[PDB]
Amino acid sequence: MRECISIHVGQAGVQIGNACWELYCLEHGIQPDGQMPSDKTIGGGDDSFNTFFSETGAGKHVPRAVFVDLEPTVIDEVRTGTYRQLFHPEQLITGKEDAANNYARGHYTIGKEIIDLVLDRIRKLADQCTGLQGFLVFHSFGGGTGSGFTSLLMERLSVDYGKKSKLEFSIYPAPQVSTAVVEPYNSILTTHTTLEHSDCAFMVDNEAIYDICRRNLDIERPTYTNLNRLIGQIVSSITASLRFDGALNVDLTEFQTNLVPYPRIHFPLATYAPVISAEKAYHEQLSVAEITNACFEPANQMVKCDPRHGKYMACCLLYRGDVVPKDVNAAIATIKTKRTIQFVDWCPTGFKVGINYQPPTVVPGGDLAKVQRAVCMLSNTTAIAEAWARLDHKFDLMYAKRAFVHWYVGEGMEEGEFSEAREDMAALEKDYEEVGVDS
Amino acid sequence: MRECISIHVGQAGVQIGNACWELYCLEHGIQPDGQMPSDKTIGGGDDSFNTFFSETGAGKHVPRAVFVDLEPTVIDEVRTGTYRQLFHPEQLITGKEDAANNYARGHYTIGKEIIDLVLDRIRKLADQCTGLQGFLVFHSFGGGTGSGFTSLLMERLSVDYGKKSKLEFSIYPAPQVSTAVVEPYNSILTTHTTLEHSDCAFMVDNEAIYDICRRNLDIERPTYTNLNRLIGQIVSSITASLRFDGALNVDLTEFQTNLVPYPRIHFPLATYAPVISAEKAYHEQLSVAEITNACFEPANQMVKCDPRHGKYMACCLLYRGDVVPKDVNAAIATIKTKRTIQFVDWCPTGFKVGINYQPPTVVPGGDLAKVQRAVCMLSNTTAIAEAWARLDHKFDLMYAKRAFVHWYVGEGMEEGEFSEAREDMAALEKDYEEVGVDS
Amino acid sequence: TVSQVCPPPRRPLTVADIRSGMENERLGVVRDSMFQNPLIVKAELGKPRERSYSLPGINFNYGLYIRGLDGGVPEAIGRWNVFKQQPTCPH
Amino acid sequence: MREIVHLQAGQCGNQIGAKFWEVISDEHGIDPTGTYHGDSDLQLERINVYYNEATGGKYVPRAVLVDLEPGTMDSVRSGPFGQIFRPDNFVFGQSGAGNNWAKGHYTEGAELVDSVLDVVRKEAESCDCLQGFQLTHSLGGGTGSGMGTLLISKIREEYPDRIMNTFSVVPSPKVSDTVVEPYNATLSVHQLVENTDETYCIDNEALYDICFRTLKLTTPTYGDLNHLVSATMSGVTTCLRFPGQLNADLRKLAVNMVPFPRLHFFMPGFAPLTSRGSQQYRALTVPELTQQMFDAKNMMAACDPRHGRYLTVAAVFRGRMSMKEVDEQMLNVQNKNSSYFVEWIPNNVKTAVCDIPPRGLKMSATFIGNSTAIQELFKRISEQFTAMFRRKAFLHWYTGEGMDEMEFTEAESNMNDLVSEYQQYQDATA
Amino acid sequence: MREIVHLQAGQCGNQIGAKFWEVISDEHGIDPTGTYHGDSDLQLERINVYYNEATGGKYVPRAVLVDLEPGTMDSVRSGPFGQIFRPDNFVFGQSGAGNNWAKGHYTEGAELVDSVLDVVRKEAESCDCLQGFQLTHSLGGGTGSGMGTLLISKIREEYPDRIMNTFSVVPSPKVSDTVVEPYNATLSVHQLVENTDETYCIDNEALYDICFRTLKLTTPTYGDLNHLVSATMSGVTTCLRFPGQLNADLRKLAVNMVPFPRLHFFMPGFAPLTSRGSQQYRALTVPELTQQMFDAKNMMAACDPRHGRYLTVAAVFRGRMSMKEVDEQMLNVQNKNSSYFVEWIPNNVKTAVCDIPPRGLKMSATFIGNSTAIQELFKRISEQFTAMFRRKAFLHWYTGEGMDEMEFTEAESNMNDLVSEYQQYQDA
Numbered sequence A, B: 001m002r003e004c005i006s007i008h009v010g011q012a013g014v015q016i017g018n019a020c021w022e023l024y025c026l027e028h029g030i031q032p033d034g035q036m037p038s039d040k041t042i043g044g045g046d047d048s049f050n051t052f053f054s055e056t057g058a059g060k061h062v063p064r065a066v067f068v069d070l071e072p073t074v075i076d077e078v079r080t081g082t083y084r085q086l087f088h089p090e091q092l093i094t095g096k097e098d099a100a101n102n103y104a105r106g107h108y109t110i111g112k113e114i115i116d117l118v119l120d121r122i123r124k125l126a127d128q129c130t131g132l133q134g135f136l137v138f139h140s141f142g143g144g145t146g147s148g149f150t151s152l153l154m155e156r157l158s159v160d161y162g163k164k165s166k167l168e169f170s171i172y173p174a175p176q177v178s179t180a181v182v183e184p185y186n187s188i189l190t191t192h193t194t195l196e197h198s199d200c201a202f203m204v205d206n207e208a209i210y211d212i213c214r215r216n217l218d219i220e221r222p223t224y225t226n227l228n229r230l231i232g233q234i235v236s237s238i239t240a241s242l243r244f245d246g247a248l249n250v251d252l253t254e255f256q257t258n259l260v261p262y263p264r265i266h267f268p269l270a271t272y273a274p275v276i277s278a279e280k281a282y283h284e285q286l287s288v289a290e291i292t293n294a295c296f297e298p299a300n301q302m303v304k305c306d307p308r309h310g311k312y313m314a315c316c317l318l319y320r321g322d323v324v325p326k327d328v329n330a331a332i333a334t335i336k337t338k339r340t341i342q343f344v345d346w347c348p349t350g351f352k353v354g355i356n357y358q359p360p361t362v363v364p365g366g367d368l369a370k371v372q373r374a375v376c377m378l379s380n381t382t383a384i385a386e387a388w389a390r391l392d393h394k395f396d397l398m399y400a401k402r403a404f405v406h407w408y409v410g411e412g413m414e415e416g417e418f419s420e421a422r423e424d425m426a427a428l429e430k431d432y433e434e435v436g437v438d439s
Numbered sequence C: 001t002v003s004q005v006c007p008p009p010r011r012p013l014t015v016a017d018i019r020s021g022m023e024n025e026r027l028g029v030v031r032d033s034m035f036q037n038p039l040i041v042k043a044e045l046g047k048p049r050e051r052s053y054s055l056p057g058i059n060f061n062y063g064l065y066i067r068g069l070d071g072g073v074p075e076a077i078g079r080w081n082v083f084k085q086q087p088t089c090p091h
Numbered sequence D: 001m002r003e004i005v006h007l008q009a010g011q012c013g014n015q016i017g018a019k020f021w022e023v024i025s026d027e028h029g030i031d032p033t034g035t036y037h038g039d040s041d042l043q044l045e046r047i048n049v050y051y052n053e054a055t056g057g058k059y060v061p062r063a064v065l066v067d068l069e070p071g072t073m074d075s076v077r078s079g080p081f082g083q084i085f086r087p088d089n090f091v092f093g094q095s096g097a098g099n100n101w102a103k104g105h106y107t108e109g110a111e112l113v114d115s116v117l118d119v120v121r122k123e124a125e126s127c128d129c130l131q132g133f134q135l136t137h138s139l140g141g142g143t144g145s146g147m148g149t150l151l152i153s154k155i156r157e158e159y160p161d162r163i164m165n166t167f168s169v170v171p172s173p174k175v176s177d178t179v180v181e182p183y184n185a186t187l188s189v190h191q192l193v194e195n196t197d198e199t200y201c202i203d204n205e206a207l208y209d210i211c212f213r214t215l216k217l218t219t220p221t222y223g224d225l226n227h228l229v230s231a232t233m234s235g236v237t238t239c240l241r242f243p244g245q246l247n248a249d250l251r252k253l254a255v256n257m258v259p260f261p262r263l264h265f266f267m268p269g270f271a272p273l274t275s276r277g278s279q280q281y282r283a284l285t286v287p288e289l290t291q292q293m294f295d296a297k298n299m300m301a302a303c304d305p306r307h308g309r310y311l312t313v314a315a316v317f318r319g320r321m322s323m324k325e326v327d328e329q330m331l332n333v334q335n336k337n338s339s340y341f342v343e344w345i346p347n348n349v350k351t352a353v354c355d356i357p358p359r360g361l362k363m364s365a366t367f368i369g370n371s372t373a374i375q376e377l378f379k380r381i382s383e384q385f386t387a388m389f390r391r392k393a394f395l396h397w398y399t400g401e402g403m404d405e406m407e408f409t410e411a412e413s414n415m416n417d418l419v420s421e422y423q424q425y426q427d428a429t430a
Numbered sequence E: 001m002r003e004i005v006h007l008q009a010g011q012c013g014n015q016i017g018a019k020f021w022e023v024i025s026d027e028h029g030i031d032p033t034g035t036y037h038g039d040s041d042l043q044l045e046r047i048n049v050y051y052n053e054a055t056g057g058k059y060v061p062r063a064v065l066v067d068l069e070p071g072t073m074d075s076v077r078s079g080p081f082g083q084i085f086r087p088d089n090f091v092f093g094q095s096g097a098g099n100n101w102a103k104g105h106y107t108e109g110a111e112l113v114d115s116v117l118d119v120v121r122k123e124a125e126s127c128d129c130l131q132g133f134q135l136t137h138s139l140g141g142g143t144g145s146g147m148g149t150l151l152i153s154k155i156r157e158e159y160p161d162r163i164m165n166t167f168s169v170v171p172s173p174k175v176s177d178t179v180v181e182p183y184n185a186t187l188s189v190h191q192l193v194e195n196t197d198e199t200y201c202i203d204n205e206a207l208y209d210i211c212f213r214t215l216k217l218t219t220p221t222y223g224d225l226n227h228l229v230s231a232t233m234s235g236v237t238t239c240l241r242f243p244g245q246l247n248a249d250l251r252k253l254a255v256n257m258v259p260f261p262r263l264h265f266f267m268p269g270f271a272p273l274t275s276r277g278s279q280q281y282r283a284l285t286v287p288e289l290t291q292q293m294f295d296a297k298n299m300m301a302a303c304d305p306r307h308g309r310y311l312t313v314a315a316v317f318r319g320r321m322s323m324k325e326v327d328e329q330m331l332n333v334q335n336k337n338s339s340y341f342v343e344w345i346p347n348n349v350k351t352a353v354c355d356i357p358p359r360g361l362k363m364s365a366t367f368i369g370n371s372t373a374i375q376e377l378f379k380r381i382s383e384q385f386t387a388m389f390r391r392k393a394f395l396h397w398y399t400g401e402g403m404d405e406m407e408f409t410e411a412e413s414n415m416n417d418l419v420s421e422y423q424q425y426q427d428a
Ligand SMILES: Nc1nc2c(ncn2[C@@H]2O[C@H](COP(=O)(O)OP(=O)(O)OP(=O)(O)O)[C@@H](O)[C@H]2O)c(=O)[nH]1
Pocket: A009, A010, A011, A012, A015, A016, A070, A098, A099, A100, A101, A102, A140, A142, A143, A144, A145, A146, A147, A171, A178, A179, A180, A205, A206, A224, A225, A227, A228
C-alpha cells in the first residue's frame, strides 16, 4: 500500500520525467499503451506496480505524477509522442506564458493563477492513497518555473500536509558553465524558502555529469537525453526498497533519520556505481568491493565539489541485485581504515546499508551496460559549503551595482527581500563551520 | 595467488612489453582473443595463469599490465594490431607531446600532467591482488621519458607503497654505439633518484646483445624485435618460480636480499645460456656441467665489460629444465677451483642456485631452438667499475664548455643539479675502490 | 564471444549498416576495416564509441558471478559425513 | 504441560522466529501444510509446549508476529513455512517506525499495543499452566527495541511471576549498520536491565566469523545466520520436551545461573559445528564435543572470554552418552582453568543431559555462559553514546515527538552503573 | 600411551616430514585412502603413537605443517599421500620470508605462531600421556631456522618437562645455496644450544657422498635423500611402537648419551644400505653390519670421526638375532679402536634390539654418534661468520627490521664457548 507522488515542475522537471517514467514502464513490464502484455500467463504475486501505478478496472495503469509547467511547448511533446495514452489528460497541466527566468513572475504575478488548479490534482491523487509515504519534486534552481513556482507550491503543500516527507531533486547551477545570466539571482532566492519546507534536498549539476559521460560511458558528445537516464537510475534505486522485497529494506522515512543530524542541514550528494560502457564491462571484474570503492572516488561525484576538503557526516549505501551481505561489511571496514577518507569525530558509526533482490534494469541498446549488481550512495558532507561560497560570490558581485533588479521589483517583490535572502545564506555557511569543528 | 604488476614506461618499455606478453600468453595457453581455447581439458583446475591474468565470468583473461608513454605513435600500434582484444581500453595510457629527450620535460612539465592518471591505474590493479610481491618497471637510461618520468614514477610509488619490491629493467647506454647526443646527461640524472628509490635495478646494454646475436645466433642483421626476444626470456626466467613448481623455489624477496650487499650497490648483471641458433642443437645435446661454464665466459656475457678486470661479489644462478641438484653441485665446485674466476675474501658462500621443472618455450617465427635445459645467471661484480668510469668522462667533456644545458634549464630545473648529481657519482666510483680491496 | 549469449553477438560497423545522414558516412573508397579502426571512425550524436570488435549478446550481463557449490548450514549441521570405504573388485 | 508463548517484533525478530519455527517443525515432524508426519510417539508425547491443536489434528504455533510495516509480514507469509501461522496472530501497523526509538515507544507504540496485548492475552489464558514468554528482537532498530521493550514492560506488569526470555541481537563495532544505533541500544538496555528474567546476546560479527572460519561457506546468507541462531534457540529449551537422564528447564537454568538481580545477560554457543570437508576426520565423542564447546570460536557474541572471569556456566547435552564423560570432563576443565573462573563460587558449572539428539546427528550440546566480558560490549556502546550525546547529533528526531533530554542522561547513568557492577564483581577477593 | 607430535617447518622440513609419513605409513600398513589394509595383527597393537582413530575406522596422523608460503602446502596436498592429513592443520602465511632470520623471528613470525600454538596445544591435549615433540628443519633459511627456534622456545617454555627432537639439515661447506647461510646458522645454533633436548645434524656433503659411493645412483634425487633421512627417523623411535628383547626409548637414549647439558648434537648413520644392483646372492650377519655401521664413509655428517674421539655411541638393531653377537662386537670394536674412544669412560657403546625390521630387510641398523668431530663444523661456520661480520656484509637488511648489532657478537661468543668445551672434553 506504500506509494509515492512525483511532482515534475519546470522544463527540466518534465524532461527528467520522460526518462524516469520510461524506466518504470520497462522495469514493471508495462507497455507504453498502459497495459500488461497480452501474451502472458496468469502467474501471481505481482503487486510491485502499486507504488507508481494505479489499476483501473479495465486493466490500465495510470501513473501517479503531475506534469506541471507554465509553457505549453514542452508538454505538447508528451501529449503527442509515444506515451500520449499512458498519462491522464489532466495530469499534464500547461500554463499560458513562461516565467522568462524570473523568480517574481514564477511566484507573484503568473504562478498565482494556476496554483488553485495544480493543488486540486494533488488532493485528487492523494485521496486514492490507502497509505501515503511522501512526495518527490523535480525542479531546477536557475530557471523561472523551477525556482518561482516550486517555492509557492512547497509552501502551500506544507500547510495542508503535516508531516509527509517531501523530497527535492534539484539541478544546482554549475560552477563554470551556465545557460543564463540571471542564474545566481534565482538560486539564492530559492534556497531561502527551501530550508524551511523541505525534509531533504538532493543536489546534481550538469557539469559533473558531462565529465562522467566522457570518461566512463565513452560519449564524446553527450545530449540532455543521456543525462536524464543517469538521474533516472538514482530515483529508481532509492525507491526500489519500497517496491521489491529485500534482505534489508529502507523506507523513505528510514533514511530521513539516518542522514539529517541537525534540522538545517539536509543536503546529501547522489552517486551511482557502476556506470561503464559495453566495451569496458567485458574486461572488468565487477565484485562488491569494486563498486563500493567507486562511490568514494572524487571523479564519480555528481556535484563539482571536492570531498577531500570536508568531512563526511553520515553515509547511506543502498545495494541492489545479488550482493551477499558479507562482502558489504568487508568492504566498509576497509574504507574506515584508510586515512584519506575522513569522518567527523561525533559520528563514529557512519554507514547504513540496504540490500535489494531485483537487479537494475537498463534500456536495450542504451549507453549503460547490463550488470546484475549496483550501489547508490547518499553521502552528507561538509564540502558543500565550498559549493555555496562560490555562488554567494557571484550573487554579491552582481548585486553591488544593482544589475537585473528592475525586472524583479517590477512584478511585485520588494528590494529588501534581496538582502534578506543573502543574510540567511551567510548564516547557513556559519552553520557548517560550527559543526565541522572538533571537540 | 602470488603475483606482480608490470609497468611499461617509454618507447623502450612498450616495445619490450610486446615481446613479453606474446611469450606469456603462449606459455599459459591463452589465445590472443583473450580466452582459453576450445577442446580444453575439462576440470583441469589450473591456477598458473592467476599470477599474470585476471579471471572474468565471461571467460576472458585480462593482463595485469600498464603501458605508459607520452606520444601516441607507439601505443596506437598495440590498439590496432592483433592484440587489441587482450588489453583493457584504459590500461593503455596515451599522452599528447613527447619529452624530446629532456629529463626536465619528463620530470617537471610533461610528466606532471598524467602522473595523477597513471597511479590511479596502479591502485585499481593492486586492489584485486590479495597478495602482491612487487612491481616490474621497464625503462632505459637513454631517453627522457625513460629518465624523467621513471624517476618520479617510482618516487611516488615508494611513498605510497612502503616495502614492496621494485625491479628496474634498464637498457644501459652502450659504450661505443649510441643514438642520442645528450644521452650522457640523462644517465647521470637518471640514477641520482635510483640510488634511493629502487630495491633493485638489472643491467643489460644494447651492444653486447649485438655480438651475441652475430656470433651465437649467426644473424648478420639483428633487429629490435630480436633484441626484445632475448630480454623476455630472462624476465620469464625470473618469474618462472612464481607460476610453476620446482625443486628449489626462489621468491622475489629471496634474491632481493641475496644480491645486494650494501644499500648503494644494487646493479646485477644478467646472462643467459645456452642461447643457440636453431640449426646447431639437433645433432648435439647439452649438459649441466657445460652450461655453467657458458655463464662465466666473457664472450657470452650480456654486458660490455670484462669480468676479468673485477672481482665477483655474489652470484644468483637459475636453472630451468631437466636439471638435477647433484650436477649443480659438481659444476659449482669446478668453477671455484679455476683461477680466472675470482671471488672476494669476505664472501666465501659466493653462489646461489635455483632449479625449476618447466623448460623454456618457443614461439612460431622466433629465432631460438628447443633446448632441454637452460641457465640464467644474475651476478654482482666489481667489473662495472669501468662502466660508469667512461660515462663520467662523457659527462664532463659535454659539461666543461657548458653545452646542451640551456635546453634543460629552460624547462624548470636549476644549474646546480648537474653538479650535485656529479659528485654523487664521484663518490660511487670511490665506493668500489673501498669495497673491492682485500682486508 | 559467439557462444556466450549466442543470440546474435553484437557485430562492429559495416558498409551495409550505414544510412543517410549518419556522421560516419564517407565519400571515396569505402571498406569495413576503416569503420572498425578507432582513429578513422567518428563518434555519433548521443551514442558511445563504436565497438571495433565483437561483443556478446544484448541480454548478456557482464562481471564475475560466483555460484556457491556448498549445501549451506543444513548440510553442515543436519548430517555427519562419515567416511565410506569402497570395496574393490576381487582380483 | 508447561507452555512457552513466542513473540516476534521487527524485521530481524520476524526472520529469526520464522527460521526457528522451521527448525522445530522439522524436529517434531510437521509438514508445511500443518499435519503430523513423524516416525515416533516421543514426538507427540510433549507437543503442547509450542503447538495448539485444531480440528482434524492440525497443529498451529503459539506465536504472535507484530510489526509496524506490512512488507516483512508479506515476506514471511509468502515463505516456505508461512502457511502454519494463525492469520489473526499477524498484527501490523500502517506507518513505519523509521529506526526511531521514540516512534517505536511513544507515538506509534501507543495505538498498537492494545490489540497486541489482546491477542497475547487470548493466547495466554488458553494454556494449562504457562511457563513463560519468549521474545526475539534486535536492539539496533526502531520497532524491535522500541515496541519490544514496551511489550516487555506491559507483559511484566500483567504477569508478575513467570519466566521472561529474550533473544536480542546486540550491536557490533565493525558491522554497525545504523547511525542511531548507540541511541537505540542504550535506550533499550535501560529497560531490559530491570524487566527481563533472561537475556541472550547474539552478535553478527561472531555469526560471520563462525560462517567463515569454522564452517568455511562461500555465500553466508541471512538464512544461514538465522539457522545458527535457531539451533541454540531450540537447544536451550530441549529438556521441556524430550525426556533425559538429568532434566533442567528454563527456571532451573535461571536459578542455577544468575546470582544477583541485575546480572542476567548471557553469551550463547553451539557445539558440533565443523566444515563439510572435515566431517570424516573427526569423531563425535564427548571430549571432542566439550573441547569444541569451551573453545572461544563458537561464542555467538563478539567478546573474548580471555578478557574476563566466568561467573556461571551451563551446558545442555543432547544424545545418548555416559555420565563420567560429562562430569569428569567438566571437572577437568574447571581444575585446569583456575585463573578464569571466580573463586567465591565453587562448582561454577552445571550440566544437563537429554536423550534425544537433533535429527541426523549423534551428539550435540548448547552452551550458556555468564561472564564479565560483556562489559566490553557495554563499554563500547557507552563511549559511542557519549560521543554522540556531547554534540547532540540526531536528537531532534527524538525530541520533536515528546522525549525529554533527561532520559538520555538517566539511561547512560544506569548503564554505567551496570558496567560498574560487572567490574566490582570481577575484581573481588576473600 | 607415549605419543609424539610431529611438526614440519619450512619447505625442506615439510618435504622431509612428508617422506617420513609415507615411510611409516608403509611400515604400519595404511593405504593413502586412510583405512587399514595389513596382514599382521601386531601392527594395530601400538598405533596410537602417531595416528588418531576417527569414526568408520580411519587413522589420521598427528602432524602439523607450518610455513609462510602456501605453495609448499599446495604441493604437499597434491602429493601421493596428501589426503590423509587433517584439513585444519595447514596454517600458512601470504608473504615470503626471503631467508631473513629477522623476518622469520620478529616481524612475520609474531602473527602466525599464535595460531600454530593454538593447533599444537589442541593436539598435545587430546592425547593420554604425551612423550614429546619432533620438529624437522634446516639451519640455513629464515623460514626454517628462525621460526623453528621460536617455535621450539615457545613449546619448551610451555611444556617444561618433556622431550624435544629437532632434526636439522646443517649447512655444508661446498654445497652453499644461500649467501646469508653462516649468519642464519650461527643465529639458529645460538638458540638451539639452550632450548632443545636432542638435535640431529644432517650434512648434504655426506648425503651426496653416500648416494654416489654406496648406493650408486646416477641421479641422487631429493626424494631419495629424504628417504634415507626417513629411514633414520623411523629407526630411532621403533622401541616405542614395537616389542623387543632390549628396549631403549627416547629418554633411555637421552640420559645415556648426553654427558653435560650443552652436548646434544648427534651424527646419525644407517647401516644395511646397499647398492641397487645385486639382491639374490647373499644374506646379512652382525659383524658385517657392525663394520658397515662404524665405517666412517657411511656417516651422514660431514665430520670425519677419525679427527676426534667418540664420547658416546648408540646402536639400534632390527630383526631376529642373538645378543652375544652384539655385545662381543661392541667389545671388540672398542678394543680395536683404542685412540678413537675416550679414556675416562669405559664401555662407550650402548645397544638396543627390536624384533621387527623394516619391510623387505632381514636385518637393519641404526647408528648415533656423539663425538668431538663436530668442533670442525662449528669452527668452519664461525670463520665464515666472522669473515662476513668484520666488514658488515648483508647486515643492513637484518638490522633495519628492529634487531641490533651486539646479538651477532653474543652468538659468536656462544659458538666460541661451545668449541672450547669440545676441546676441553676431548683432551682430558
Ligand atoms: N540535468 C538537466 N538539466 C536541465 C535539463 N534541461 C534544462 N536543464 C537546466 O535547466 C536550467 C534552466 O531551466 P530551464 O531548462 O530553462 O527551464 P525552467 O527551469 O522551467 O525555467 P523557465 O523555462 O524560465 O520556466 C538550465 O540551466 C539547465 O541547466 C535536462 O534535461 N537535464
